Design a protein around this ligand. Structure first.
Ligand SMILES: Cc1sc(NC(=O)C2=C(C(=O)O)CCC2)c(-c2nc(C(F)(F)F)no2)c1C1CC1
Length: 129
């Protein structure tokens, strides 16, 4: 699949922000401050190479990787983890770090980011701007 993920996406809605952030051990102060922030996240894709600028609550996280190659991803807790991002199907980026299964799916202008920890499904829905 050679689908382009490039764009700026405005967060529309999210489910289980607080349950997820609590499950990852984010300090309560940051959870309360960040829970209602609906920012813009950016993806810059060049072939297999990706640069993500994610607005997640009160944190901005920058991650860069090439699909299929070992990368070091920065987590919400500030911890850096070694992992690999893969292309799944026609429109998905999939990775697994610190017992989280992450799925980034693009459907036209709608991006769905799903982070599954135990049976908590943290889902973010963003729209291209
Ligand atoms: C708390 C979040 S949120 C999120 N990603 C998103 O929220 C996205 C969008 C949004 O703002 O809705 C649009 C595109 C991705 C990541 C993350 N995912 C990846 C990936 F590479 F796996 F996609 N790398 O970091 C993280 C963890 C700290 C890491």
């Amino acid at each position: 699949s050679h689908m382009s993920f490039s764009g700026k996406y405005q967060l529309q809605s999210q489910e289980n922000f607080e349950a997820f952030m609590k499950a990852i051990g984010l300090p309560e102060e940051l959870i309360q401050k960040g829970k209602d922030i609906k920012g813009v996240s950016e993806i810059v894709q060049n072939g297999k190479h990706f640069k993500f600028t994610i607005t997640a609550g009160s944190k901005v996280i920058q991650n860069e990787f090439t699909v299929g190659e070992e990368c070091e991803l920065e987590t919400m807790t500030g911890e850096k983890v070694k992992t690999v991002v893969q292309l799944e199907g026609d429109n998905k980026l999939v990775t697994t770090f610190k017992n989280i299964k992450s799925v980034t799916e693009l459907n036209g202008d709608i991006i769905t980011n799903t982070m599954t920890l135990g049976d908590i499904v943290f889902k973010r829905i963003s729209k291209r701007i």
